[PDB]
Scaffold this active site. Structure first.
Site: not given
Lengths: 798, 798
Positions: A436, A438
């Site tokens: 997502c 990171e």
């Protein structure tokens, strides 16, 4: 061209492929007792030798993990105990349904499930949790349904997001990795038990897995060659012959051209899918950087064109669009509405020496995204304080396409945090976006375990109902914090909330301790480990809990931030300070879901809210965040990691909301919680810049124990129209950068389009909206998640 | 008011005060053999009991380290062996002369010098350096004169810059510190040798030094009371009573008002001067933060006024201007032209939580600086990506006064570097400017040893003359890299330079290993240690080499960056690539200082130069920087520290220049080298914005082993005139911050003013110019340092 390929699987339900699971199982059932990385490598070889290889119509690169059309892959090692109910439920599931042929159903029940009965990670994890924790994790004795309270996420993916060092593949080839491993074997002390038990089997696993991916690649070369010989159209015949030549070379040997580099990377990424079910699907790295030497050289030598390279990228993404992440558990599925995926593609940012990394490939990827109709690739654009003007402009123009691309990740937040946790500046500056939101250092990151997703909205409910939740009746779930109507001051209510919050954190850290030790007995990653410097140096599989010199960056999730902040803000202001209503009146109003209590509902919606740069609510948010930062700082060292509070929701805010009744912020029972660190639905009434500021006010920059926060902001088309709108968006991004916020991404839509698409799904089948780090067809989303998208404030004036 | 005070010592040579040195010596000669911190504490008690205390005319606060007027202090423990010649030479020294009365000279010869014969730090260091190192350090066997090659800087100040935790004093008072130490003593195991020898004597010293500064303060309270009682003027009588009352309370007890906080901080700051000769004079910290609570409460309670508070600030700075840093060795004096001083006062920046720290006191300090005519205080303004607009505007207006205030220090460069070296974010965000440009965490920094100042222009000369320097004839100094006329390629010249460069680094690090271990046997700092958390926790004096949990941030200096880059750029371009002249012609032209070779001189001044955003030169500059970063990264761990490359010159570029003959960039023999990381004189022909980019281009952000760079930029008044000029400066400051540059400071002057003042010092005696992190009267400077200031390009545009 690519539209031809695109027409072939348009608007088709994905099928479940079983070959990988079948041959994985055939190998695994014959190697019980052997070291797990070695078993995994032998299974990958067994797959490499026996699974079908495909040369697909019209394609310029080859490689699949499954059948023609859209397909997913089975991972019985993880959740094979769900196979029985997945056969019954998957074709009819309301969200993200999967079709399953009768033939593939027979292999599952007959050849896959039996061996795994009683051996899956989920069976082991369900038994491993103590009762106090279990009650907050699962709703049944065999852990088949979550309670969506302290939600463990290790049982519906092999691991968290990951980024391979693909460039290592392109430059060295897998034959080089293999020879290093042979040399290491030759250097061992044959008399040493640790060399014999800890070193040799790991290195033997690397050798096999190298032979495995290479043999798999060469089977494509043979198939392509056989087709070229029977191909009558000359153009296609030259392309098939090109395939046979490239795949006989890569990924065994270092890539020599941009085409080889694409195929080498494509081979690595597909085989990665065969090896394991990486969270969000394995990510792709800084392609605009590690492809650049090939692109630049071919461009100069007339080997490639701007258009030709763009064609090859599109070949890569149509393939990515045919692989669908298959979640067979209902928890996994409800976390992943609309066939969710995040094969993050990183562009822009800084080089390892701190200079801007924009190149022509950067602009090609942006253009490639703008002209590929599917919501692929998962484009992530890195921002820093010297992001060039032209770059930001092109980022803005891509955003104004309305599809939600690309998502923005802020160097100025990641790089200081990562050097503060042991990264050299070169490593930090070179990070890749992963999953997502990171950041990954492909040869320094070593942590791979899925972490807790915590429904802190439920923790608030347990204050309101003294350890219970309406959804679960009298079930003894939370701490007995007392009758809320017996609290005499605001400070007693807050303490009650704090106690529930620490119970959830305490629960989550016990979960992770057990999970992190358990996973290493069920998961290994030999191909991924061979591309990791520390794995190779210390002879340890990536999923080993501790690897020398590694940095373990993991997560626990705060779900419902805005929802909880505003609810607490309302209670403090309206019940305790202004005494506009009593605790019993509020609870009564909640118990009947505001039916007949519309006056209190409106009153509650009038208190200060998060996302308005309003310190009354923002101080509450900061104190809630401080609870998680300080908890992580104190108790993460025991686990040998950084277990940092993060605000990335997946699509869990839907199921998390479906189990939380009406809350003091005026939100209706069972509806979606607020998303990530966004403002609660319709609570931002002071413009979009105050959302950025409340995100700033609600953080605690004095401590390092923090990871990403996912921020969704929505503009109307009018608000960003034209050159002036592009300039506003560009400037808004500069402010986001200055504020050290981690992530931002935008929808650009009129509310009426979302409403019309609900009132006429068939007409708006191709409408694509940004949900949470990804985009999906609005019509594939549940009504509850649609309602989340609709109720998000559309900013018209910025 | 303070104009009356300032008028009393206007235009006077400072005198050498001996009281502190006398009473320090009387105690030290009676305590030989005891642990050094305890001896120091007893020495400070003896001073506290016997030295004169002063209540000065017109003052509202009290505290001196010497006689009325401008004065300096003697520190025989450091360099007492120079006392004999300082008696002969200081009153007539061409730069920074100090007067000494006949009676004070008699105290020195009779009461100070005899004990320190054979006991000074400089005598010990001189004998402790091996011959190979000594030849590069000193020009005579007793190390009385530097060679200005590998210049050690530990022998002309007790330590490097330092910042006390003044706020701890204001909030706790020294009685609390004493009681903390007493409890710690009470908790010791009386049978334990380590408690008896390593803990108790350290804690006993803290007790004494707390008693010492308190007793010293109360003697001021006593004297003020005696003066008030005989005071005939009612106004002055009240000021004496306030002083008598305030000084009986602070610094023993926590401050209660803004006036008390100033007096407490002043007491700590003056007593620190009595304790040791801190580098640049002890610095003052973030006064606009820790004074803010007192200012706000009194201001609200009608206790203080903006004008009265500004008066109290000015009372402090007129006091500071009377204390002059006394350097008696000729090395120390030539490093510190014009009574150089850097009692850094930090304002602005971010809070410990990362929020902007501007408050109304911040703006008052700016106004305070603009209305005090002297070049005090040493104002340092912190910059970050969210520096407010009004803040930057007022900073620009202060810069537009033309005196050089304030100097700019960039959070975005300091903070990531410091957490990467172990600082929590709160400690990094709360850093204080110290000395010229350094950042200090007053309870985490533990390193105090002066580091090397390396004349790399001399290293280049040793390439031109195969290990020799023209100034030193046939003295066999450096590596014998060969006849430069025998080099066939640029790479051979570059390698020769690299060899000399590494010889200097190796030399400096042997110096530092010996220095860092030697200093603990000559210097102790009980009052400064009592204010440091780690000292108190681990019972270790600040000057200990290693203190558990501490971070050691030290330095080695690159002098002549611009000079060397351009000389190499010219050689690379003109001799080896374009072959416009032979090596023999260049050497011939250099040896005769371009006399008769002016055309060669002009051709050499035409090559690409550092500071023009020209990668041809900036790439050389980047590679030279990389040499020192990589060396530091490799060999500092052995020293238990970060020994980081820094480019902060003091005024050593004058003496370093006075020993370097004509250089390949066209610079004349024996003239100033380029300053800091600024452009070489008159080499920046592309505007001031290209200087910032070249400073960026010449760094290596991929590694952390770097400290400050001092950057001097000069605008003409025309360039910055009016509201547009203020906006241009603000905009230029944003670009400086965005580029992660550490420091910048500005002169605003017409070249003619510099020339007119040279041709008529008496007429322009009060002209103040920014030199190197400080400002001084242009007419107090040597001609060589004036020429450096005159030759800096004055920019009309940006």
């Amino acid at each position: 061209r690519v539209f031809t390929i695109l027409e072939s699987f348009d608007n088709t339900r994905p099928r479940i492929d079983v070959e990988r699971a079948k041959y994985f199982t055939e190998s695994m059932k014959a190697t019980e007792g052997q070291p797990l990385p070695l078993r995994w490598a032998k299974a990958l070889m067994h797959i490499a030798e026996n699974m079908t290889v495909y040369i697909d119509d019209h394609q310029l690169i080859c490689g699949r993990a499954g059948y023609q059309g859209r397909y997913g892959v089975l991972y019985p090692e993880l959740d094979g105990d769900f196979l029985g109910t997945a056969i019954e439920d998957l074709p009819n599931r309301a969200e993200s349904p999967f079709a399953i042929t009768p033939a593939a159903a027979a292999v599952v029940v007959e050849e896959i499930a039996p061996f795994w009965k009683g051996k899956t990670y989920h069976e082991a994890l369900n038994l491993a949790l103590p009762a106090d924790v279990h009650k907050l994790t699962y709703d049944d004795p065999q852990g088949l349904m979550s309670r969506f309270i302290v939600n463990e996420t290790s049982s519906f993916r092999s691991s968290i997001q990951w980024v391979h060092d693909y460039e290592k593949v392109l430059k060295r080839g897998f034959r080089s990795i293999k020879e290093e491993a042979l040399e290491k074997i030759a250097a061992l002390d044959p008399m040493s038990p640790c060399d014999n038990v800890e070193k040799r089997p790991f290195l033997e696993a690397i050798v096999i897995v190298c032979d495995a991916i290479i043999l798999w690649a060469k089977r494509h070369a043979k198939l392509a060659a056989e087709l070229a010989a029977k191909e009558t159209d000359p153009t296609r015949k030259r392309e098939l012959e090109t395939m046979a030549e490239i795949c006989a070379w890569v990924p065994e040997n270092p890539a020599r051209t941009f085409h080889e580099a694409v195929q080498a990377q494509w081979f690595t990424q597909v085989f990665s899918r065969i090896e394991q079910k990486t969270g969000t699907i394995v990510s792709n790295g800084r392609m605009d950087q590690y492809f650049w030497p090939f692109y630049e050289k071919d461009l100069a030598e007339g080997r490639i064109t701007e258009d030709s390279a763009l064609e090859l990228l599109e070949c890569m993404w149509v393939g990515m669009a045919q692989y669908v992440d298959l979640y067979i558990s209902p928890t996994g599925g409800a976390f992943n509405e609309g066939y969710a995926h995040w094969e993050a593609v990183t562009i822009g940012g800084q080089t390892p020496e701190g200079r801007d990394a924009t190149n022509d490939l950067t602009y090609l990827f942006l253009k490639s995204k703008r002209e590929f109709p599917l919501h692929y690739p998962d484009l992530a654009a890195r921002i820093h304080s010297r992001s060039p003007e032209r770059y930001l402009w092109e980022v803005a123009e891509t955003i104004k396409d309305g599809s939600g691309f690309p998502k923005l990740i802020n160097d100025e937040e990641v790089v200081p945090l990562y050097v503060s946790k042991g990264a050299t500046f070169a490593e930090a500056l070179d990070y890749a976006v992963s999953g997502c939101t990171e950041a990954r250092m492909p040869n320094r990151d070593t942590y791979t375990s899925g972490g807790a997703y915590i429904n802190f909205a439920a923790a608030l409910e347990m204050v309101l109902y003294n350890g219970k939740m309406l959804k679960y009746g009298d079930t003894d779930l939370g701490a007995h914090t007392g009758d809320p109507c017996e609290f005499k001051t605001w400070e007693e209510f807050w303490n009650a909330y704090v106690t529930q919050h620490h119970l959830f954190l305490k629960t989550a850290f016990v979960q992770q301790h057990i999970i992190n030790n358990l996973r290493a007995r069920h998961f290994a990653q030999p191909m991924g480990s061979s591309l990791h410097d520390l794995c190779m140096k210390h002879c340890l599989d990536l999923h080993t809990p501790q690897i020398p010199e590694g940095i373990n960056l993991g997560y626990f999730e705060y779900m419902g931030f805005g929802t909880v902040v505003d609810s607490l803000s309302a209670i403090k202001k309206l019940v305790f300070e202004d005494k506009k209503l009593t605790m019993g009146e509020l609870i009564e109003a909640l118990k009947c879901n505001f039916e007949g209590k519309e006056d209190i509902q409106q009153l509650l919606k009038s208190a200060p809210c998060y996302g308005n740069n309003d310190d009354y609510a923002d101080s509450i948010a900061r104190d809630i965040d401080a609870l998680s930062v300080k908890y992580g700082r104190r108790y993460s060292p025991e686990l040998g990691m950084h277990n940092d509070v993060r605000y990335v929701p997946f699509t869990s805010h839907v199921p998390f909301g479906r189990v939380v009744s009406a809350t003091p912020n005026g939100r209706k029972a069972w509806s979606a919680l607020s998303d990530g660190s966004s403002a609660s639905h319709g609570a931002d009434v002071n413009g979009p810049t105050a959302i950025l500021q409340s995100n700033f006010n609600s953080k605690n920059y004095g401590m390092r124990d923090r990871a990403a926060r996912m921020l969704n902001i929505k503009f109307t088309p009018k608000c960003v129209e034209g050159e002036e709108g592009s300039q506003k968006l560009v400037s808004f991004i500069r402010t986001f950068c200055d504020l050290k916020l981690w992530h931002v991404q935008f929808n650009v839509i009129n509310k009426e389009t979302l409403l019309a698409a609900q009132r006429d799904p068939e007409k708006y089948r191709n409408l694509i909206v940004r949900i949470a780090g990804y985009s999906a067809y609005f019509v594939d989303l549940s009504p509850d998640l649609q309602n989340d998208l609709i109720a998000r404030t559309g900013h018209d004036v910025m």
